[PDB]
C-alpha cells in the first residue's frame, strides 16, 4: 500500500508515502537506545503515541515541545533543544524525530545537524508544504539576529515518512499554501501534476481523495530528482517576486500565496520575453486562481518590491517543464510584466 | 618546498605544511568574490596581510576579530559572526579563513558549517594543538549552556595551511600542551615520532629546528589516516581519564597536561591487564616527563574522576606499541590499582 520515493544521494534515503505509518517508524528506530520527538504544540497526542509505541519496543523515547510556527525556529528554541538533548543523554547513535510542519522539520533538523556533530533524524511532516518541500532534501534553516534561514546546516535525514492521515486536521488555508509549491513542480518538471489538478481542482485539495496522494508522489519525485542533481535553482521558480512580497507584507501572507503571485509574474516575464507560449503562460493564472490562490497583488507595490529584491535573477520557463534563467532583465520589462499581472 | 598530506575523505582536501604560505592561500582563494578571515586578537597584523594580499587580487576581503581562547568559542561569538557574515554579504560561494588556535578553528568552523548550509573554509592553525588536531578532521565544537563541545557540526574544510613560521611566537607552555597529542599519535600509530622526540626532547620543541616539522607531518598523517576510515576511537587514547581531569579542574589544567596524565594511566591499566609490556608502559611517563608534562595527579580524586567519566566505561588501551585495543567495563578494583600506581 505505501509507495516510496528513493532520493539518490549518498547514501540514498527513502520518502515513504501512505496512511498510518507507525509500523514503518518502528521498523526504522527499534534498535536506537534513545529517541527524542520534537513536535509542534498541536501534535502532542500524536507525539505521545510514537513515544509510547517506541518505549514499548525497549527504547528510552522522550518528547519535546516547541513553539508553533515561526517561533519554534528562533535561535533560543535551538538552545532549548540542545539543553534537553543534554539532560536526556542523547548520544551519537541515537535519533531525533520531527513532527509538524516545515518549521518543526527545519528546527529539529538543525538541532540534529548540530548535536554531537550530527545525529540521525526522521522527518514526519504534517503540512503539505512540509511534505513536499521542507522535509525532503536536507537543507535546514533557523531564525537568528542575521535574518530568516541564512543560518542553517546541511544534513540529510535517515528517512521521511509522509503520512496522509495527518492531513485530515489540516485547514483549507494551509492545504492551499502548500499546493502552490505543488503547482510549481507541475510547471517546472511534471505537467501531469497540472492535468491532475485541472481535472477537478476541489478534489485536488481533499486529503481523503485519490488525487492528492498522487500529487504528493509526483511533487516529491520532482524534488528528489533535483536534490540528487546548478539546477537546484529551478525550485525557486516563482520565489524571486514571491519572497519580496512575503517581506513587504511582514510575513503575514502565507508563503504559498506569495509564491503563487510570483509564478504568475515569472510566466508573464517569460511570455513578454518571447520564451513562453501564451497558452502555457495563461495556464499559471487559471490553475492557481481555481485553487483559491492569489494571482495579483497591489499594482503600486513594484517600486518597494524592486528595493527588497536587492543584479536580479529569475527562473523562467522556456516552454512547459523547460526552465531557464533570466539575468539582470531591464527594469522597464519588470514594470511591463507587473502591469499585465496586476 | 611545502609538503602536502592528503586527507582522503569525500571531498578530499590537502593539509599543506611549510613556511610562509601566503602564496598558497592566494592560489586557493583569489577567485572568490568575498573572503572573511576570522582570527584571534594577537594575529591581527597577520590577518591584515592576508586581507591585504587578497584585496590586491580583486577579492572583497574582510577580517573579523573574535575573543581569545575559550571565550571566542561561546555561542554569543557565533551569533556575532553570523551577523557579520550577513552584513558583509558572504554567499554560498564565498569562503572563510580561520587564523589562530583550536578555538578559532572550531568557532570559525562551526560558523562556516552553519552559514547558508555550509560554505568553504580554509584553516590556518597557529598552535601545535591546532595544527595537529583541531584543524584536521571536520569536527567542530562550541561552548553552550549544554556544556563544552556537545554542540558542533561536521564539515570538511577546503584546505589546511600549516605555516611553521607562525610557531615562532608560540610560548613553551602551549607548545608542550600540543606535544601531548603528538606523543599520543606516536603510541597509537607511528613510533618514529617517539624515536624522534627521545633523540633530543628539546630539539623537538624548537620551531626553528628540523625535528618539529617532521613530528607535525607524522602526527597529521596519523590523524588523516584515521579519519579517512570505529577506528576514530584511538584518537581518544589518554582522553578518558584526561577529559575527567580537565573537567574536574574547571579547565584550569592545560588540555595537554591532562592528556599526558591520561596516557600514563591507560599505559598502567594495559600493563596490569597483561596487554602491554612493562617497557612500553614506562616509556609513556619517560617521554611525557622529559617533555615537561605532568605524569601523575591527586591520589584522592579517583571517585570524582569516575563520576565525571560516567557522565559502562570504555578505554583505549595498547596491546603493544601502535596496537590499540579496547577495555570495556574494567573491574573497579583494576582501576583503583592502576590509579594508585600512577598517583604514588
Ligand atoms: N529547509 C527547507 O528546505 C524548507 C523548504 C520550504 C519551507 N521551509 C520552511 O517551512 C516553514 C513553513 O512551513 P509550514 O508551512 O509547514 O509552516 P508551519 O510548520 O509553521 O505550519 C503551519 C501551521 O500548521 C499547523 N499544523 C501542522 N500540522 C498540522 C496538522 N496536521 N493539522 C493541523 N494543523 C497543523 C502548525 O501547528 C502551524 O501552526 C518556513 O519556516 C520555511 O522556511 C523549509
Ligand atoms: N574540533 C576538534 O577536533 C578539536 C580537537 C582538539 C581541540 N579542539 C579545541 O581546541 C581548543 C584548544 O586549542 P588551543 O590549545 O589552540 O587553544 P586556543 O585556541 O585557546 O589558543 C591558546 C592560546 O595561544 C594563543 N596563540 C595562538 N596562536 C599563537 C601564536 N602563533 N603565537 C603566540 N600565541 C598564540 C591564543 O591566542 C590563545 O591564547 C579547545 O577549545 C578544544 O576543544 C578541537
XYZ file of C-alpha atoms and ligand atoms in Angstrom:
774
model
C 0.000 0.000 0.000
C 2.728 2.539 0.958
C 4.629 3.994 -2.006
C 8.245 5.106 -1.529
C 10.455 7.539 -3.444
C 14.178 6.981 -3.075
C 16.390 10.046 -3.084
C 19.526 9.073 -4.985
C 22.049 10.715 -2.779
C 24.986 9.240 -0.837
C 23.727 7.229 0.947
C 20.216 7.056 -0.693
C 17.241 7.574 1.610
C 13.523 6.888 1.349
C 10.483 9.067 1.424
C 7.556 6.833 2.383
C 4.017 7.828 1.340
C 0.938 6.167 2.723
C -1.537 6.049 5.590
C -0.850 5.222 9.305
C 2.900 4.856 9.193
C 3.616 3.816 12.752
C 4.782 0.417 11.671
C 7.335 1.840 9.354
C 8.531 4.306 12.008
C 9.014 1.355 14.420
C 10.994 -0.712 11.830
C 13.488 2.218 11.495
C 14.176 3.203 15.090
C 13.664 -0.082 17.084
C 17.418 -0.578 17.698
C 18.007 3.018 18.838
C 18.791 3.189 22.534
C 17.298 6.701 22.720
C 14.924 8.800 20.565
C 13.536 12.351 21.010
C 10.430 13.627 19.268
C 10.286 17.364 18.538
C 6.684 18.247 17.886
C 4.586 21.342 17.429
C 2.030 22.091 20.215
C -0.951 20.663 18.362
C 0.513 17.214 17.946
C 1.353 16.241 21.498
C -1.134 13.408 21.443
C 0.418 12.024 18.212
C 3.830 12.511 19.821
C 2.809 10.535 22.928
C 1.697 7.639 20.729
C 5.012 7.490 18.973
C 6.802 7.632 22.335
C 4.526 5.015 23.895
C 4.965 2.735 20.927
C 8.728 3.232 20.823
C 9.092 2.864 24.592
C 7.185 -0.396 24.017
C 9.956 -1.787 21.816
C 12.601 -1.237 24.528
C 13.726 2.380 23.808
C 14.121 5.422 26.044
C 11.729 7.544 23.944
C 11.295 11.174 25.025
C 9.270 14.144 23.714
C 9.956 17.836 23.375
C 7.510 20.570 22.541
C 8.436 23.674 20.620
C 6.617 26.900 19.932
C 4.295 26.659 16.952
C 5.208 28.021 13.615
C 7.962 30.520 13.109
C 8.719 30.936 16.752
C 9.702 27.314 17.059
C 12.530 28.342 14.812
C 14.252 31.155 16.717
C 17.773 30.549 17.960
C 16.751 30.336 21.642
C 14.456 27.436 20.725
C 17.514 25.687 19.267
C 19.337 26.392 22.563
C 16.380 24.926 24.339
C 16.507 21.678 22.312
C 20.275 21.398 22.880
C 19.915 21.577 26.665
C 17.144 18.998 26.605
C 19.192 16.642 24.440
C 21.856 17.321 27.086
C 19.692 16.205 30.070
C 18.344 13.151 28.262
C 21.816 11.973 27.321
C 21.098 11.725 23.582
C 24.240 10.198 22.005
C 25.920 9.813 18.645
C 23.975 6.705 17.761
C 20.570 7.890 18.905
C 17.935 9.765 16.875
C 15.559 12.650 16.582
C 12.063 12.587 15.176
C 10.365 15.728 13.912
C 6.605 16.019 13.934
C 4.895 19.056 12.460
C 5.219 21.481 9.555
C 8.301 22.810 7.784
C 9.159 24.855 10.886
C 9.318 21.788 13.032
C 11.386 19.976 10.395
C 13.787 22.912 9.968
C 14.448 23.428 13.686
C 14.612 19.795 14.588
C 16.767 19.299 11.532
C 19.111 21.997 12.567
C 19.387 20.680 16.142
C 20.096 17.205 14.779
C 22.723 18.599 12.429
C 24.491 20.410 15.250
C 24.225 17.892 18.111
C 27.447 15.946 18.623
C 28.310 16.666 15.069
C 25.129 15.244 13.592
C 22.685 12.604 14.701
C 20.065 10.656 12.812
C 16.701 12.333 12.171
C 13.401 11.028 10.688
C 11.026 13.647 9.481
C 7.316 13.273 9.896
C 5.924 16.273 8.149
C 2.383 17.139 8.785
C 1.686 20.090 6.479
C 1.522 19.656 2.700
C 4.371 22.185 2.408
C 6.437 20.254 4.931
C 5.569 17.152 2.975
C 6.551 18.224 -0.441
C 9.258 20.680 0.362
C 10.623 21.257 3.796
C 11.208 17.664 4.822
C 12.686 16.468 1.591
C 16.349 17.153 0.806
C 18.485 18.058 3.781
C 18.549 21.920 3.883
C 17.840 23.282 7.371
C 17.194 26.915 8.449
C 16.624 28.871 11.634
C 15.772 32.439 12.567
C 18.565 34.420 14.127
C 19.698 38.026 14.539
C 21.113 37.685 10.991
C 17.635 37.106 9.253
C 15.418 34.197 8.191
C 17.142 30.950 7.162
C 20.517 32.480 6.453
C 21.752 30.250 9.248
C 21.201 26.562 8.750
C 23.159 23.367 8.297
C 23.062 20.764 5.580
C 22.088 17.423 6.920
C 20.224 14.625 5.229
C 17.686 12.684 7.271
C 17.567 8.914 7.706
C 14.077 8.696 6.196
C 10.920 10.794 5.718
C 7.509 9.462 6.487
C 4.649 11.179 4.732
C 1.507 10.098 6.474
C -1.571 11.221 4.646
C -3.726 10.550 7.672
C -2.194 13.587 9.425
C -3.624 15.936 6.812
C -7.208 15.285 7.992
C -6.793 18.004 10.621
C -5.004 20.489 8.371
C -7.137 23.521 7.423
C -8.062 24.598 3.942
C -5.769 27.621 4.142
C -2.549 25.650 4.778
C -3.501 22.956 2.299
C -3.746 25.715 -0.373
C -0.498 27.212 0.898
C 1.355 24.010 0.025
C -0.490 23.396 -3.268
C 1.334 26.424 -4.688
C 4.554 24.542 -4.351
C 2.924 21.529 -5.981
C 1.786 23.576 -8.924
C 5.309 24.898 -9.168
C 6.597 21.360 -9.571
C 3.962 20.812 -12.293
C 5.242 23.682 -14.434
C 8.922 23.018 -13.958
C 9.216 19.258 -14.192
C 5.987 17.272 -14.294
C 2.956 18.554 -16.289
C 0.852 15.546 -15.211
C 0.635 17.363 -11.875
C -1.095 20.082 -13.851
C -3.580 17.762 -15.614
C -4.459 16.030 -12.376
C -5.317 19.346 -10.754
C -7.088 20.638 -13.829
C -9.478 17.749 -13.941
C -11.058 18.690 -10.632
C -9.404 21.364 -8.525
C -11.514 20.814 -5.429
C -10.665 17.098 -5.419
C -7.022 18.057 -5.550
C -7.457 19.661 -2.141
C -9.192 16.758 -0.490
C -6.784 14.622 1.636
C -9.259 11.772 1.517
C -9.356 11.547 -2.334
C -7.366 9.568 -4.947
C -5.824 12.683 -6.373
C -3.796 14.238 -3.573
C -1.699 11.140 -2.816
C -0.575 11.049 -6.447
C 0.080 14.811 -6.455
C 2.380 14.367 -3.474
C 4.093 11.333 -5.023
C 4.819 13.411 -8.128
C 5.795 16.674 -6.446
C 8.157 14.764 -4.194
C 9.556 12.806 -7.155
C 10.363 16.163 -8.744
C 12.060 17.458 -5.604
C 14.060 14.207 -5.141
C 15.292 14.435 -8.742
C 16.541 17.912 -8.123
C 18.295 17.232 -4.876
C 20.082 14.247 -6.240
C 21.418 16.526 -9.014
C 23.291 24.497 -10.595
C 19.767 23.083 -11.201
C 18.530 23.327 -7.560
C 17.757 26.834 -8.728
C 14.598 25.585 -10.555
C 12.864 25.114 -7.211
C 12.944 28.859 -6.920
C 10.525 29.275 -9.741
C 8.207 31.981 -8.568
C 10.209 32.707 -5.367
C 12.012 35.906 -6.568
C 8.994 38.137 -6.537
C 7.358 35.704 -4.106
C 9.899 36.286 -1.316
C 9.845 40.048 -1.884
C 6.051 40.050 -1.447
C 6.428 37.932 1.702
C 8.931 40.512 3.107
C 6.815 43.507 2.135
C 3.780 42.007 3.933
C 5.987 41.319 7.037
C 5.314 37.529 6.789
C 1.547 37.752 7.286
C 0.974 36.365 3.783
C 1.164 32.597 3.655
C 4.326 31.690 1.743
C 2.254 29.839 -0.867
C 0.125 32.822 -1.617
C 3.243 34.870 -2.351
C 4.803 32.103 -4.429
C 1.515 31.995 -6.342
C 1.818 35.676 -7.384
C 5.467 35.016 -8.210
C 4.626 32.187 -10.576
C 2.100 34.291 -12.428
C 4.796 37.031 -12.618
C 7.562 34.683 -13.793
C 5.131 33.469 -16.501
C 4.440 36.981 -17.687
C 8.149 37.750 -17.715
C 8.883 34.731 -19.910
C 5.896 35.492 -22.137
C 6.924 39.145 -22.760
C 10.476 37.832 -23.497
C 9.208 35.641 -26.319
C 10.399 32.486 -24.434
C 6.999 31.143 -23.363
C 3.791 30.479 -25.342
C 0.641 32.365 -24.407
C -1.255 29.172 -23.576
C 1.285 27.859 -21.057
C 1.737 31.368 -19.708
C -2.030 31.775 -19.141
C -2.332 28.347 -17.609
C -0.402 29.612 -14.488
C -3.175 32.149 -13.697
C -6.022 29.628 -14.368
C -4.653 26.722 -12.342
C -3.674 28.917 -9.454
C -6.858 31.041 -9.197
C -9.028 27.975 -9.356
C -7.305 26.529 -6.329
C -8.037 29.745 -4.442
C -4.508 31.122 -4.679
C -3.880 34.794 -5.429
C -2.893 35.844 -8.933
C -2.478 39.557 -8.305
C -1.017 41.892 -5.796
C -1.105 45.630 -5.163
C -0.491 47.304 -8.629
C 1.527 50.129 -6.860
C 3.877 47.923 -4.910
C 6.517 47.431 -7.617
C 8.969 50.175 -6.529
C 9.104 48.881 -2.976
C 9.429 45.273 -4.225
C 12.322 46.095 -6.584
C 14.079 47.602 -3.499
C 13.539 44.466 -1.410
C 14.791 42.229 -4.253
C 18.323 43.669 -3.531
C 21.798 42.071 -10.141
C 18.498 40.091 -10.217
C 17.983 36.528 -11.433
C 14.742 34.843 -12.403
C 13.723 31.371 -13.139
C 11.631 31.492 -16.273
C 10.025 28.856 -18.428
C 11.322 28.356 -21.925
C 8.356 26.167 -22.580
C 6.372 23.843 -20.358
C 8.731 21.992 -17.951
C 11.775 23.677 -19.506
C 13.117 26.210 -17.011
C 15.795 28.724 -17.951
C 17.257 31.836 -16.425
C 16.883 35.454 -16.972
C 19.714 37.509 -15.515
C 19.544 41.269 -14.954
C 16.441 41.921 -17.051
C 15.570 45.580 -17.861
C 13.575 47.340 -15.066
C 11.014 48.502 -17.636
C 10.494 44.884 -18.612
C 9.803 44.144 -14.972
C 7.379 47.104 -14.985
C 5.547 45.843 -18.071
C 5.274 42.244 -16.719
C 3.939 43.637 -13.413
C 1.184 45.603 -15.187
C -0.067 42.531 -17.105
C -0.269 40.674 -13.742
C -1.650 43.458 -11.590
C 59.288 23.074 -0.852
C 55.913 22.629 1.079
C 54.796 19.109 1.980
C 51.167 18.032 1.414
C 49.318 15.405 3.331
C 46.115 14.443 1.508
C 43.080 13.724 3.635
C 41.300 11.022 1.760
C 37.775 11.815 2.510
C 34.943 12.943 0.271
C 35.512 15.551 -0.807
C 39.265 15.151 -0.181
C 41.387 18.076 0.981
C 45.056 18.815 1.424
C 46.980 19.800 4.524
C 49.983 21.841 3.335
C 52.954 22.171 5.682
C 55.719 24.667 5.044
C 56.996 28.194 5.763
C 55.341 31.449 4.572
C 52.250 30.148 2.899
C 50.681 33.361 1.689
C 51.184 32.372 -1.912
C 49.351 29.123 -1.377
C 46.388 30.972 0.226
C 46.194 33.349 -2.742
C 46.214 30.374 -5.230
C 43.318 28.907 -3.235
C 41.099 31.943 -2.732
C 41.951 34.528 -5.478
C 38.845 33.667 -7.480
C 36.400 34.161 -4.609
C 34.263 37.290 -4.613
C 34.383 37.501 -0.768
C 36.611 36.046 1.963
C 36.172 36.662 5.702
C 39.193 35.973 7.961
C 38.136 35.064 11.464
C 41.071 35.493 13.807
C 42.271 35.634 17.437
C 43.344 39.012 18.903
C 47.084 38.540 18.610
C 47.043 37.684 14.979
C 45.529 40.886 13.751
C 48.636 42.067 11.862
C 48.755 38.663 10.127
C 45.036 38.844 9.405
C 45.664 42.163 7.725
C 48.403 40.858 5.460
C 46.112 38.064 4.349
C 43.237 40.522 3.813
C 45.624 42.843 2.006
C 47.038 40.341 -0.442
C 43.570 39.024 -1.180
C 42.306 42.521 -1.952
C 45.190 43.038 -4.376
C 43.676 40.154 -6.268
C 40.216 41.782 -6.526
C 38.735 39.762 -3.624
C 36.441 41.739 -1.369
C 38.351 40.649 1.791
C 37.146 41.274 5.359
C 38.560 40.484 8.817
C 36.717 39.563 11.984
C 38.458 39.512 15.337
C 36.959 37.188 17.921
C 37.652 36.974 21.645
C 40.656 34.922 22.566
C 40.702 31.325 23.726
C 37.576 29.729 25.099
C 35.678 32.966 25.170
C 35.986 33.006 21.397
C 34.066 29.706 21.225
C 30.966 30.788 23.091
C 27.522 30.747 21.463
C 27.322 34.576 21.521
C 30.537 34.843 19.489
C 28.888 32.583 16.974
C 25.773 34.896 16.761
C 28.134 37.763 16.205
C 29.992 36.036 13.356
C 26.741 35.174 11.586
C 25.697 38.900 11.940
C 28.947 39.994 10.326
C 28.638 37.432 7.545
C 25.131 38.739 6.852
C 26.403 42.354 6.912
C 29.342 41.609 4.595
C 27.125 39.668 2.199
C 29.028 36.337 2.360
C 27.314 33.995 -0.112
C 27.145 30.367 -0.886
C 30.354 30.551 -2.998
C 32.396 32.681 -0.739
C 34.869 31.497 1.864
C 36.036 31.888 5.439
C 39.550 31.676 6.735
C 40.342 30.770 10.374
C 43.507 32.057 11.994
C 44.539 31.112 15.487
C 44.478 28.097 17.800
C 41.990 25.285 18.029
C 39.397 27.699 19.485
C 39.472 29.819 16.335
C 39.301 26.869 14.022
C 36.349 25.440 15.909
C 34.273 28.574 16.179
C 35.093 29.628 12.626
C 34.408 26.032 11.524
C 31.025 25.942 13.148
C 30.196 29.228 11.532
C 31.167 28.095 8.027
C 29.244 24.845 8.532
C 26.059 26.647 9.605
C 26.115 29.575 7.170
C 23.849 29.235 4.088
C 24.065 25.490 4.579
C 27.816 25.296 4.646
C 30.368 27.408 2.776
C 34.076 26.925 2.117
C 36.618 27.353 4.932
C 40.417 27.222 4.966
C 42.132 26.639 8.306
C 45.262 28.467 9.266
C 46.052 26.916 12.651
C 48.695 28.757 14.688
C 49.247 26.461 17.681
C 50.739 22.970 17.823
C 47.469 21.595 19.039
C 45.516 23.393 16.336
C 47.924 22.176 13.650
C 47.887 18.614 14.576
C 44.481 18.085 15.923
C 41.912 20.755 15.753
C 42.294 21.836 12.134
C 42.274 18.356 10.667
C 39.077 16.302 10.532
C 35.943 18.337 10.018
C 34.599 18.077 13.624
C 33.690 21.450 15.071
C 32.639 22.159 18.671
C 31.353 25.227 20.543
C 30.516 26.078 24.120
C 26.875 26.447 25.026
C 24.676 26.203 28.055
C 24.617 22.432 27.301
C 28.366 22.307 28.158
C 31.577 22.393 26.175
C 31.631 20.915 22.685
C 28.439 19.000 22.878
C 27.122 21.264 20.158
C 29.060 21.224 16.879
C 28.685 20.497 13.175
C 30.544 18.189 10.834
C 32.051 19.990 7.903
C 35.198 19.379 5.866
C 37.462 22.383 5.112
C 38.680 23.298 1.587
C 42.279 23.114 2.744
C 44.536 23.343 5.757
C 47.574 25.541 5.748
C 50.168 24.757 8.391
C 52.655 27.562 8.367
C 55.542 26.867 10.692
C 56.591 30.485 10.700
C 53.632 31.168 12.991
C 55.039 28.897 15.740
C 57.958 31.378 16.317
C 55.806 33.343 18.735
C 54.192 30.399 20.477
C 55.238 30.044 24.175
C 56.833 26.819 25.513
C 53.783 26.106 27.646
C 51.412 25.996 24.643
C 53.967 24.110 22.590
C 54.261 21.410 25.283
C 50.498 21.340 25.507
C 50.255 20.418 21.823
C 53.045 17.876 22.102
C 50.960 15.516 24.213
C 48.802 14.888 21.126
C 51.918 14.357 19.043
C 53.145 11.794 21.601
C 49.607 10.279 21.633
C 49.935 9.722 17.905
C 53.304 8.087 18.424
C 51.972 5.482 20.774
C 48.928 4.557 18.735
C 50.105 4.669 15.153
C 53.632 5.918 14.494
C 56.543 5.040 16.813
C 59.086 7.070 14.748
C 57.552 10.147 16.384
C 58.666 8.757 19.783
C 62.151 7.946 18.368
C 62.482 11.479 17.142
C 61.434 13.044 20.417
C 63.655 10.767 22.570
C 66.655 11.634 20.410
C 66.669 15.267 21.778
C 63.447 16.262 23.550
C 64.416 19.926 23.470
C 65.076 19.789 19.713
C 61.531 18.537 19.446
C 60.214 21.707 20.993
C 62.016 24.151 18.715
C 60.088 25.663 15.782
C 63.448 26.665 14.245
C 64.940 23.097 14.137
C 64.270 20.251 11.654
C 62.675 17.882 14.123
C 59.366 19.688 14.806
C 58.287 19.850 11.141
C 58.665 16.104 10.745
C 56.734 15.496 14.047
C 53.939 17.721 12.733
C 53.836 15.925 9.387
C 53.717 12.495 11.002
C 51.166 13.435 13.599
C 48.916 14.892 10.900
C 49.448 11.777 8.738
C 48.297 9.624 11.660
C 45.191 11.670 12.078
C 44.406 11.942 8.342
C 44.666 8.156 8.026
C 42.317 7.553 10.890
C 39.692 9.996 9.718
C 39.762 8.628 6.247
C 38.459 5.412 7.795
C 35.047 2.547 14.738
C 38.746 3.292 14.418
C 38.213 7.033 15.204
C 38.279 5.965 18.868
C 42.081 5.518 19.043
C 42.424 9.270 18.868
C 40.916 9.279 22.360
C 43.836 7.299 23.799
C 44.566 9.030 27.121
C 41.477 11.277 26.771
C 39.219 9.070 29.031
C 40.951 9.901 32.297
C 42.367 13.045 30.733
C 38.988 14.590 29.905
C 37.881 13.904 33.501
C 40.933 15.620 34.963
C 40.346 18.600 32.685
C 36.694 18.831 33.746
C 37.460 18.454 37.484
C 39.944 21.292 37.184
C 37.178 23.506 35.756
C 39.670 23.699 32.862
C 42.458 25.420 34.791
C 44.702 22.444 33.830
C 46.045 22.655 30.256
C 44.477 20.052 27.912
C 47.907 18.531 27.212
C 48.866 18.135 30.849
C 45.539 16.307 31.429
C 46.049 14.071 28.366
C 49.562 13.331 29.499
C 48.250 12.054 32.860
C 45.578 10.061 30.978
C 48.150 8.381 28.671
C 50.189 7.308 31.705
C 47.042 5.955 33.318
C 45.955 3.990 30.248
C 49.531 2.703 29.956
C 49.387 1.358 33.520
C 45.940 -0.022 33.092
C 47.016 -2.034 29.965
C 50.175 -3.115 31.874
C 48.352 -4.516 34.922
C 45.953 -6.214 32.427
C 48.893 -8.106 30.821
C 48.257 -6.492 27.472
C 51.247 -4.156 27.407
C 54.927 -4.897 28.094
C 56.490 -3.135 31.072
C 58.924 -1.202 28.804
C 56.354 0.348 26.520
C 54.212 1.165 29.563
C 57.092 3.020 31.301
C 58.049 4.739 28.020
C 54.853 6.822 28.420
C 55.995 8.522 31.572
C 59.551 8.967 30.401
C 58.646 10.748 27.203
C 55.918 12.820 28.739
C 58.021 13.876 31.795
C 61.043 14.556 29.614
C 58.916 16.995 27.656
C 57.818 18.847 30.834
C 54.354 17.224 31.112
C 52.728 16.038 34.340
C 52.829 12.385 34.940
C 50.530 11.986 37.934
C 47.539 13.544 39.542
C 45.902 13.852 43.014
C 45.848 10.409 44.813
C 42.351 11.025 46.307
C 40.495 12.165 43.130
C 39.565 8.793 41.613
C 35.976 8.655 42.939
C 35.157 12.046 41.482
C 37.035 11.091 38.301
C 34.853 8.011 37.915
C 31.695 10.113 38.488
C 32.816 12.504 35.671
C 33.693 9.546 33.365
C 30.214 8.108 33.968
C 28.600 11.385 32.712
C 29.827 1.084 31.192
C 33.323 2.732 30.922
C 35.424 2.065 27.844
C 39.109 2.563 27.467
C 41.503 2.731 24.673
C 44.457 0.563 25.654
C 47.546 -0.611 23.846
C 48.062 -4.292 23.064
C 51.632 -3.393 22.204
C 53.220 -0.274 20.764
C 50.928 1.048 17.981
C 48.431 -1.715 18.572
C 45.428 -0.014 20.123
C 42.671 -2.200 21.581
C 39.782 -1.640 23.984
C 38.891 -2.332 27.518
C 35.146 -2.444 28.183
C 33.761 -2.251 31.735
C 37.029 -2.934 33.631
C 36.889 -4.206 37.205
C 36.617 -1.161 39.545
C 39.491 -2.673 41.577
C 41.669 -2.823 38.496
C 41.081 0.990 38.119
C 41.790 1.799 41.812
C 45.120 -0.103 41.361
C 46.266 1.490 38.072
C 45.481 4.920 39.507
C 47.386 4.274 42.725
C 50.303 3.092 40.558
C 50.072 6.425 38.789
C 49.500 8.661 41.847
C 52.043 7.228 44.468
N 14.564 23.567 4.670
C 13.798 23.662 3.573
O 14.206 23.122 2.564
C 12.443 24.378 3.562
C 11.669 24.434 2.408
C 10.439 25.078 2.413
C 9.975 25.662 3.594
N 10.708 25.605 4.712
C 10.247 26.217 5.959
O 8.972 25.752 6.364
C 8.389 26.726 7.231
C 6.899 26.850 6.959
O 6.340 25.534 6.803
P 4.779 25.260 7.105
O 4.018 25.922 6.011
O 4.580 23.805 7.339
O 4.628 26.176 8.412
P 4.440 25.636 9.921
O 5.264 24.399 10.105
O 4.598 26.944 10.599
O 2.931 25.103 9.936
C 1.765 25.933 9.747
C 0.742 25.663 10.884
O 0.019 24.428 10.746
C -0.062 23.723 11.998
N -0.119 22.281 11.654
C 0.915 21.495 11.300
N 0.475 20.250 11.010
C -0.855 20.293 11.181
C -1.914 19.282 11.023
N -1.584 18.034 10.610
N -3.185 19.675 11.286
C -3.461 20.929 11.680
N -2.514 21.870 11.813
C -1.228 21.570 11.578
C 1.184 24.147 12.738
O 0.904 23.980 14.125
C 1.360 25.589 12.279
O 0.566 26.480 13.073
C 9.069 28.028 6.914
O 9.753 28.434 8.087
C 10.035 27.696 5.787
O 11.272 28.416 5.840
C 11.905 24.974 4.710
N 37.488 20.201 16.638
C 38.414 19.348 17.134
O 38.607 18.246 16.673
C 39.322 19.762 18.253
C 40.408 18.944 18.574
C 41.242 19.373 19.601
C 40.992 20.587 20.256
N 39.952 21.344 19.919
C 39.684 22.601 20.611
O 40.834 23.413 20.568
C 40.752 24.334 21.684
C 42.125 24.466 22.329
O 43.004 24.821 21.278
P 44.302 25.652 21.579
O 45.042 24.836 22.539
O 44.852 26.176 20.314
O 43.690 26.835 22.434
P 43.467 28.353 21.940
O 42.938 28.386 20.521
O 42.653 28.950 23.061
O 44.897 29.042 21.885
C 45.787 29.049 23.003
C 46.438 30.435 23.143
O 47.552 30.671 22.251
C 47.414 31.981 21.648
N 48.117 31.814 20.378
C 47.575 31.175 19.327
N 48.491 31.130 18.347
C 49.601 31.744 18.797
C 50.932 32.009 18.183
N 51.165 31.541 16.947
N 51.856 32.677 18.889
C 51.563 33.064 20.143
N 50.360 32.830 20.714
C 49.378 32.167 20.086
C 45.915 32.073 21.502
O 45.532 33.411 21.283
C 45.427 31.508 22.823
O 45.629 32.437 23.870
C 39.774 23.766 22.696
O 38.656 24.615 22.703
C 39.446 22.427 22.101
O 38.143 21.961 22.391
C 39.116 20.966 18.941
